[model samples]
Target chain A: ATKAVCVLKGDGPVQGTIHFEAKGDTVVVTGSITGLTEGDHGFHVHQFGDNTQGCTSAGPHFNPLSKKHGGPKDEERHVGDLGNVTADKNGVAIVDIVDPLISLSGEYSIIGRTMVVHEKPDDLGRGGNEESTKTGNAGSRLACGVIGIAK
Target chain B: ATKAVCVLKGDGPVQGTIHFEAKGDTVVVTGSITGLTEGDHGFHVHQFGDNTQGCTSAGPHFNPLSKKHGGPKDEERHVGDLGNVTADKNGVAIVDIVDPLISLSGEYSIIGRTMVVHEKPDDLGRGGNEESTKTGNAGSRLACGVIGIAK
Candidate 1:
């Protein structure tokens, strides 16, 4: 598929709408997210689309290649890594990014997966710790959604 | 406790904030909900706070006395049943209701349970069918939240 969509819902104060469009070799991620309390929050694609149990059962970050956690712009990153989205004082985050490693089809396709928003900033594996290498110590889940093929 | 709060979230385009306050022998349920397509939607407190698997795992509508399904004004209604909330053209539902059976504490307290919004209107056990007597034939869950004591 060349397009996909997601609508995030949280147990707390978070909600968002995300769009994925494949253009050439990159996938463009864009959306307007609201209700976060300000500052940065981790963003990533998870392994499963199962959002049962309030986002906990969605599993860990999508890392089919067995790579470590890294920044969205880092070469050594998990395919799921999209770095952090900074929220404004009003608690809204407008997202727009083009990622090369992430795909909508073929080997690294992210369709049918889950997307998550974390409660804290992601260190992108640069925190110099074991947990950072895995989750960037992103804290607890704030909200999540499932990705599906979009018209 | 005398008060409780909940933030409803969904895998789709639904999000809401609900409040419960105890007064005398009754509880006042109030909230502003958004993202339903329009028209009436069933409102009820479910048996569990587990929202995993989206809203499916929250279990059935709370029925401590094992009563049949009915409207908010019906004596035969489940303690969890609060009848329906109607959405506007913009997909927002403003709710306000006083329920005599729901409690925030004691044997039948609803704290830590789930509040769910169904996709279809509850028949209030008046549909003249077996399903109506049990579930009012309320359709699938649209969103849910866990009730917690307020600060």
Candidate 2:
């Protein structure tokens, strides 16, 4: 079994952790994030693992397949398009999901990518705009953390 | 014995904790912080303890003394003025100090204040500038947390 973890740090009012567990053919991601607005926010796995200059240094979304931005269950979506997480009135978000595209021992491995939580909701490529197909127009980058192998 | 603590959080690349211990006549402050540039960063106790809007809601520095902003040792300094914390090349800072102005059980109690870490160095009121006299010209609010009473 392959496991990974990320300690997310945000610009402000964003702090939390994300855990990735590879079991069988799916990758299970689970964690709770606090200090967020009480609404939907975009979440995705970004390209680079570097955090030297904060989330901006993490580059764009992970799209090894060169596909367009779409929902997690879409047929032609970026490998990192995991969709959205909603925060409650108390400014806390609980994220738990499983994805089939991510792998631990294959060409689609996400071992070195950065996980990003955005400031706006992800349209899931249905917004019918150019930027929507590119990034879902997810507004500014909020919190980010590099995925690392865990014991 | 009374005590307080704050968990510092920022937009990105800032994380830490601040601990306050009421030991007889002084308040002992100690903590370790990471993800900061290598140099001095302004440190202060802000007015409000609410962090719903990040550090912006924390209001101005805790100045019950109604005095000028100066170094920690100055006799004529705001109750919030504690000078700066220095980070190493690794972007980590270790702060340990004792102050005579702060308290937890009396009129000058700081149980309801916020702890603010700034992005720039605090000139300790020696900069001889207008802004310096007010805030030591601390550039931007980096990280902040509400000071809560510890059990």
Candidate 3:
């Protein structure tokens, strides 16, 4: 299996480790995050790891398919849309995601990109706002890390 | 100040952080690495953080200026060429680098690139070999990480 990891960091107290293991065309993303509020947080892979402007420089969601913002299970969602991660009262979110389109290699490879945890829940474009379609109005970036190749 | 960090990881014990703090046009790179042989290692920023084929997918050293490979102090050096970092008997290497060419913003910003520690020293284009002019014969990548904008 192919593997990768992203060690998240932030100016605040947020921290986490996200791992990706690829077998065949599917990839399993798993990890845990701490220091979040007791609620659902938007989780998505962004287009660029260009944090030159902090998380704001990450640009938009990784949508090479030109799709709209939707949940991970939706057939019409962006390649970066992984839906939400709910943090418990103890400020921990357990991630166990299996993706069918997020490949580790080939034409749609996302290796050089970034994964970002938002400050708010992903509305999955149901917010009915202008920004909802583009971002789900996922709120500000909480903490982010770049996806790197691993052994 | 604008800041960025790259957390290094590899199949081996090679791990480290390369921090970039922009103060004007200069960036101060400070960090340390543990678990390396007691010798000099080539330190460079590579194009693309794509580690799909381990470190081989990182491509060539980031050379936006279209210059030949040389030492950091050379006027003809590639922007990615930050020279070498030497490890001690304790397998730890201290880093204190200041470069004038590299930037975190502007047309040649390298925020989305990768930083790599090589298995061998960089000859700085003086090895008198064919690869020296291009890669400085830096050898295999010991470790690497994606550069991300830091809060």
Best by DockQ: 3
The positional error of residue B89 in candidate 2, measured at the CA in angstroms, is 13
Give the TM-scores of the predictions, in the order they appear: 0.53, 0.51, 0.59
Q: Which residue runs of candidate 1 sit more than 4 Å off their true CA positions? A: B1-151
DockQ values per model: 0.03, 0.02, 0.16
Where is model 2 chain B poorest over a 10-residue stretch in terms of lDDT? Answer: B142-151
What's the true lDDT of residue B149 in model 2? 42
Model 1: pairs clashing at backbone N, Cα or C within 3 Å: A52-B52, A52-B53, A53-B51, A53-B52, A53-B53
Please, what are the lDDT tens digits per residue for candidate 1 over residues A1-151?
Answer: 6776676887897999788899999999999889997999999998765544567866888888998999998888899999999999999999998999999777687754678999999999999999999999899989887665454
Better of 2 and 3 by lDDT: 3
| Alpha-carbon DockQ of candidate 1 | 0.03
lDDT of 2 by residue, A5-113 (tens): 6667777979887778888799999998899899999999887654546688677788888999999989989999999999999989999989999875456766545
Query: Residues B23-68, candidate 3, lDDT per residue (tens digit)?
Result: 8768999999888989999999887665545667778988878999
Report the Cα lDDT for residue B147, model 2: 57
Q: Pairs clashing in candidate 2?
A: A10-B11, A10-B12, A11-B10, A11-B11, A11-B12, A12-B10, A12-B11
Candidate 2: what lDDT?
0.79
